[PDB]
Design an enzyme around this catalytic site. Structure first.
Site, PDB file in Angstrom:
ATOM      1  N   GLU A  40     -13.141  99.255 -38.829  1.00 12.56           N
ATOM      2  CA  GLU A  40     -12.801  99.623 -37.455  1.00 12.56           C
ATOM      3  C   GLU A  40     -14.002 100.225 -36.708  1.00 12.56           C
ATOM      4  O   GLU A  40     -13.844 101.006 -35.764  1.00 12.56           O
ATOM      5  CB  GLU A  40     -11.682 100.671 -37.512  1.00 12.56           C
ATOM      6  CG  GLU A  40     -10.281 100.219 -37.922  1.00 12.56           C
ATOM      7  CD  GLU A  40      -9.990  99.176 -38.990  1.00 12.56           C
ATOM      8  OE1 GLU A  40      -9.331  99.458 -40.021  1.00 12.56           O
ATOM      9  OE2 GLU A  40     -10.389  98.026 -38.726  1.00 12.56           O
ATOM     10  N   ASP A  50     -15.373  91.181 -43.596  1.00  9.67           N
ATOM     11  CA  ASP A  50     -14.460  90.358 -42.813  1.00  9.67           C
ATOM     12  C   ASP A  50     -14.382  90.841 -41.366  1.00  9.67           C
ATOM     13  O   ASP A  50     -14.261  92.036 -41.092  1.00  9.67           O
ATOM     14  CB  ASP A  50     -13.094  90.241 -43.476  1.00  9.67           C
ATOM     15  CG  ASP A  50     -12.116  89.308 -42.772  1.00  9.67           C
ATOM     16  OD1 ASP A  50     -12.519  88.165 -42.459  1.00  9.67           O
ATOM     17  OD2 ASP A  50     -10.964  89.730 -42.535  1.00  9.67           O
ATOM     18  N   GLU A  89     -36.518  90.469 -33.425  1.00  9.25           N
ATOM     19  CA  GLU A  89     -37.865  89.929 -33.282  1.00  9.25           C
ATOM     20  C   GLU A  89     -38.806  90.521 -34.327  1.00  9.25           C
ATOM     21  O   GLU A  89     -38.849  91.733 -34.506  1.00  9.25           O
ATOM     22  CB  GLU A  89     -38.400  90.061 -31.851  1.00  9.25           C
ATOM     23  CG  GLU A  89     -39.873  89.684 -31.720  1.00  9.25           C
ATOM     24  CD  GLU A  89     -40.366  89.272 -30.343  1.00  9.25           C
ATOM     25  OE1 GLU A  89     -39.526  89.236 -29.425  1.00  9.25           O
ATOM     26  OE2 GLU A  89     -41.579  88.995 -30.177  1.00  9.25           O
ATOM     27  N   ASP A 100     -42.158  91.138 -34.658  1.00 14.25           N
ATOM     28  CA  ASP A 100     -42.849  92.269 -34.052  1.00 14.25           C
ATOM     29  C   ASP A 100     -44.117  92.621 -34.819  1.00 14.25           C
ATOM     30  O   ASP A 100     -45.185  92.751 -34.217  1.00 14.25           O
ATOM     31  CB  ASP A 100     -41.934  93.446 -33.751  1.00 14.25           C
ATOM     32  CG  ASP A 100     -41.278  93.359 -32.385  1.00 14.25           C
ATOM     33  OD1 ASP A 100     -41.629  92.419 -31.653  1.00 14.25           O
ATOM     34  OD2 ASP A 100     -40.440  94.229 -32.062  1.00 14.25           O
TER      35      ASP A 100
END
Lengths: 563, 563, 563
Positions: free
Chosen positions: C153, C212, C222, C224
């Protein structure tokens, strides 16, 4: 004072504490003063108990700031309980206000109903814009979590919704429009939320709610269990009796079944719904049915149900919408990874007629035997649909063919294929059955557009069609070989490429006939370089032959021009 | 002190109040001290009036925290007005800083321009990263709301933009790059926002802005009305003269029309734009045109316009991009649910040539008569495109055919279909017209790849092609039947399956010819089990027959091998 | 007291300051008191230095609120450094708690590791729900930024992740499940984030993590540069050894290459991964490979890589999943806008067999020569797949054909095409090679469903199939013309339309044979209106002709019924 500069008693941090008698009677002391933000502190400053509000009315964009979080537990953070027999906890309303309330809401607050069964509303918002409820909870009653009427520009994200609803409740409700149909719920974001263990519609709308531009995206909906109040009727997680533009995308839905509190489907769309509902790229688990679409334009693609522990593959949308629906299968994969319901296998090049443009409103209706179950009803003397011919086909050297699946509502329907008002060919439509009606367009007849029209006297139901180039055209023509003496021959009339195909004919099949040609030696003579031809039928029996045939037919093959 | 532990005078809640003379001159007292967060309190602590800032320069990631909300109304919450003749309200700039500013912004603030007509900028951000503007407003002037130059990693979400722009303003501007083309606007989120009643570009970019990786998603754009400053030019809601990777998705757009302040289209993309712009799954209402794409790779799918009260169906993108564009129709549904503009009906198996891979850069150009209006220009001695042959077709038993729609820019273009450097067949291309050029690949010629090449001396414009398996091949060959005596017959040279199809020939059509074959009884004799054949032509007239034909042709049908 | 109402000493703003000895020993004074929110003030109140925590354990949903922002720089805002040799900075754990912790997290905080090389974890979260980390940073160590075990959650959005990971670290880790496989990471949002300059997996999961319903959307990844700790192994930006329902969408990925710290691919999915992973509409720049999918159901579409400065086109997913994968090409466009890798050109109407439904679990396996590299292994006496016949084809007047690409694992595989348990036709499958097997369904045999079954004794590998209507059927039959006297003729047995096509035959091709028919004049006689026919073979040589053929064949063309 002289607090190095200012005065002391700096109640700029307007906590609930500065107001009046009791929490709720502090009420409008808060509100009367017209304070912009009110802090509500944690459950520690109310001795482990939540602050208990009831029937508090907010007429101005009031921020009620908290130091709680989205979550079920009530032992840390700001927690707020509805009072003993109150209908609501807060009613953010701009009813009667000269200038509409714009802003405010609920930040970092665990909001409960007084009891797990109190019908009513937790939080009502009426005639309001730019309401935000963020990092909150809405839980513990049998009415509605958040009830919305004439609210726009708003956001409800990152919240928990739980142990809400029942017989006459649910989660977030789009209620009736306030006055004019434009006093609706529109431009609302419902994102990042968690819905759990609820009854009624988890999100719903009334028959007169007219919502528009609703995001319901990247939420998690899961059965979880049955709350204090079970459903009394067959229910849907998302129950929108009205809905216009809506994105319902990238959500999870898990364990929504009939046996699990009567969630017979995930989404239901009412008959009077209009605007485009995108139900796309949802990942379902052990769900029983996508739902029931009774209305609106609904587009559904990219949804996948892992059947998990469920007993059956997910069932697909039932669709009875009067409007174009594009309902790609919700793929059913078993918990072992095996597909048991794949994408719909359509006829090659099938287009449901409702997907085509046309100049007349033609309501769709349900037919069990239609390719998509959805079919157009087209009355007498009315266009079915009209479409643009691909530019690659308009080269004067392409034969095309329309195949349309149609059923006459009664005797006397006729489909005409036309180029504009020019009638190319007609088919009488059989009443009461689905049949495929084939129309060829000679290469010299193809122009900018084609249309099908009901030119008959009864309604025709139009399922879908296949339209495309073909590399041949069938051709059947009258002959009269008569009775031939021994060795005598008959030559059919010339079959001009112009009549056969409207363009050069590359070749033809062997000729066939409307009856036996026993004893006739048959060949074809070209009559021009462009594929015109006659058929010669010579009596090879050695005695008089009375022929019986009156028609000859070929398949004529077409390629390009002469080189 | 001894505040149970610490000292008192705990100005940890650094409100504006602790600083200096007046709000704006408190300015750098705030800033000079290098305080990290400054609270700005509501309109109550400034006597119903907004705090009024001008030309305040922030050189460090300063949080300016408020207790307002996104919203138009100015009577509750933090409200900030630009000063009488100031160019900006805040300039968050890392120009000259040793270490680039990273963080800070505007939280819970209603930001206004001094007057509904003040050209300039509300908020400028230059040479900065990780700027956030959340739960804010940007309103009430004729210049730019937020002006961005060399800003990266940033977020502007959940805000209102309103009564902004005009002749030389707009909403959010991606300005020119600061120094090197990499000093751009990149990695920016524009989400959850509401745009309303504005002029100029609502979001735009300059001709030298080089933006990359921009989200513009789940916003609401709506005309609403004309602000104090109407548009002086034909305008677009989203006007990006330059744009690279961009997601423009799941937005609403409502009532953007020419009559409504000259919003002639929703999106315009400049000629020099590069990177992939996804304009996908937007839900439009009563919009006049998707817009004008003059450059870049743009992908547009899933967009639907409900025409509503508009007089005309939405118009589709005009595309003149030199680069691959995949512009699926914006579906037009009338307010009654009737489709009046459906998906583009393409030729079956059509692929625009720009969608194919190739080893040479070939700029696309506009041709009104191209299937998508976009066509490749391919100079002499240059590959058109080269593609992989499907593995199911490389079984030595599949004939395939390429049909390419092409126009010579001038006389002398030639298309060759090739397998690598092996030339399979050639077509001279007619100047000045679109025509379909057909190339067959015998089953024994198909390998790993196929290419089309311009092997001529002029440019060819290449629209698109159809490539796929075919179940027959047309074949035409020389004959010389000459003059036949009564009853005499001529047998054509053998037609080897190897030459006809490159594989077993299943059957052939009746033979046709380059002229009439009157009086010739014609049949075919197999010369081998593999479908090689001769045609026999027998004089059935009873007297000398001088034949005229010099070519015979058939369609030859192909299936698999011998079983 | 009498602070106009309350008492003074109002430590409702519980800053760190009220607690105990030192920052970390204030520790549980904070925590023991069970305070809900703790403010941490900026780097100014700790003399330019960050507050330095280590091994602080939080057993309850504690908000640690800051006044920093997401960002690398450490000189403005709240900044927090891990201590000298501590394993973690905070461990939010509900291990041992009666009621599971639900809420709390990190708001507006720049979180650093003590040193750029300290292996360990910055922030661990175990057995927890509704954790939020917003507007933060996670940087400057060689272990894991955020380590997650049994967290549900939750939300991690708008953060920076940088200079993290290496040999035994990474960014966000989904660790092993805590106890039962349901004690996983589920329902987690990772949005709006920036990942930069990191080693290990940027987001990853262990072999037993069972995650899940994960969103990873609208982030920026990126390269970098290489951090203090380079990768020791070939690495992937997203490395999920287990993953169920997941949305990986609308992200940027830039400069991920082997030479750039051994990022050999963008996404890797482990063999034991299950649930549907959507890798869709990502915009990549100069990336080397999409990655390696070794397991799970993975759907990848809409991804586009601009090759930029990279030396090679992006490589496509390697797929060895035992489960259905639908991996549409990641389009490669060169920096000049030229496509160099386009969409996969599939055989017309190709369906990979794993996309079809079936009643048996059939693991997919890798074959280099399969159309998608993924093929089903179907043992003896087992259904391959079964699909629904389109309703437009079930009109009693449509011939259809199945072409299936198959390879026998060994001698003795047989494919049967069936309608239910009725066997329509069979093909012996050649061992060790891919071949196309063709099955025709006569018009009178087509019903509700069709299935392919292995009715042989060895395994068959099934690639994909083409299924659809056809406008002809090939037919071959026995003849016995024998030896013909001068002028004598032989007539073949009747070829009933019922046997040929199962419906009216429109026409036939010229007949061909299993050998030469030199000297035979051949024609066809219709024997009924419905296209039944015989072939007549007449000795046109003038002397005895010993024929050699024993089979005749035609293509038979089909159209509709008799009208």
């Amino acid at each position: 004072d002289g607090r190095t500069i200012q005065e002391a008693f700096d109640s700029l941090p307007r906590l609930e504490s500065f107001s009046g008698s009791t929490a709720t009677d502090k009420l409008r002391a808060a509100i009367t003063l017209g304070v912009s933000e009110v802090a509500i502190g944690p459950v520690e400053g109310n001795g482990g108990r939540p602050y208990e509000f009831g029937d508090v009315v907010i007429p101005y964009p009031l921020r009620i700031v908290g130091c709680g979080s989205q979550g079920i537990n009530v032992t840390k953070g700001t927690v707020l309980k509805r009072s003993a027999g109150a209908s609501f906890m807060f009613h953010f309303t701009g009813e009667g206000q000269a200038q509409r309330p714009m802003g405010g809401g609920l930040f970092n607050i665990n909001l409960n109903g007084d009891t797990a069964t109190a019908l009513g509303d937790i939080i009502k918002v009426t005639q309001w814009s730019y309401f935000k409820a963020n990092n909150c909870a809405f839980q513990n009653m049998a009415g509605w979590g958040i009830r919305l009427k004439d609210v726009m520009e708003s956001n409800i994200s990152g919240n928990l919704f739980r142990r809400l609803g029942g017989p006459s409740g649910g989660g977030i409700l789009f209620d009736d429009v306030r006055s004019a149909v434009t006093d609706n719920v529109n431009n609302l974001h419902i994102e990042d939320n968690t819905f759990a263990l609820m009854s009624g519609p988890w999100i719903g709308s009334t028959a007169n709610s007219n919502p528009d531009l609703i995001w319901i995206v990247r939420n998690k909906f899961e059965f979880d269990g049955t709350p204090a109040a079970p459903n009394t009727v067959d229910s849907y997680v998302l129950d929108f009796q009205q809905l216009s533009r809506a994105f319902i995308q990238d959500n999870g839905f898990t364990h929504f079944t009939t046996e699990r509190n009567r969630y017979v489907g995930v989404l239901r769309v009412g008959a009077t719904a209009v605007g485009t509902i995108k139900f796309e790229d949802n990942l379902l688990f052990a769900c029983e049915s996508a739902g029931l679409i009774a209305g609106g334009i609904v587009v559904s693609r990219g949804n996948v149900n892992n059947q998990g522990s469920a007993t059956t593959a997910i069932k697909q949308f039932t669709n009875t919408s009067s409007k174009l629906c594009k309902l790609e299968r919700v793929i059913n994969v078993q918990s072992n990874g095996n597909v048991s319901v794949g994408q719909q296998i359509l006829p090659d090049g099938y287009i449901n007629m409702a997907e085509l443009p046309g100049n007349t409103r033609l309501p769709s209706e349900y037919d069990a035997d239609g390719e998509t179950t959805s079919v157009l009803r087209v009355p007498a003397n009315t266009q079915v649909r009209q479409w643009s011919v691909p530019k690659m086909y308009k080269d004067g050297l392409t034969v095309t063919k329309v195949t349309v699946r149609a059923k006459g509502a009664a005797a006397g329907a006729i489909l005409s294929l036309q180029s504009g008002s020019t009638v190319l060919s007609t088919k009488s439509i059989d009443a009461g059955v689905w049949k495929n009606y084939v129309f060829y367009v000679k290469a010299n007849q193809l122009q900018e557009t084609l249309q099908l029209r009901n030119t008959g006297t009864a309604d025709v139901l139009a399922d879908g069609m296949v339209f495309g180039k073909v590399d041949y055209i069938d051709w059947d023509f009258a002959i009269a070989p008569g009775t031939l003496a021994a060795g005598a021959k008959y030559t059919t009339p010339n079959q001009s490429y112009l009549d056969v195909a409207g363009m050069r004919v590359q070749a033809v099949s062997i000729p066939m006939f409307d009856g036996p040609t026993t004893g006739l030696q048959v060949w074809v003579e070209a009559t021009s370089a462009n594929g015109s031809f006659v058929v010669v039928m010579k009596n090879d029996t050695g005695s008089e032959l009375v022929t019986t045939v009156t028609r000859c037919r070929v398949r004529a093959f077409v390629s390009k021009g002469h080189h």
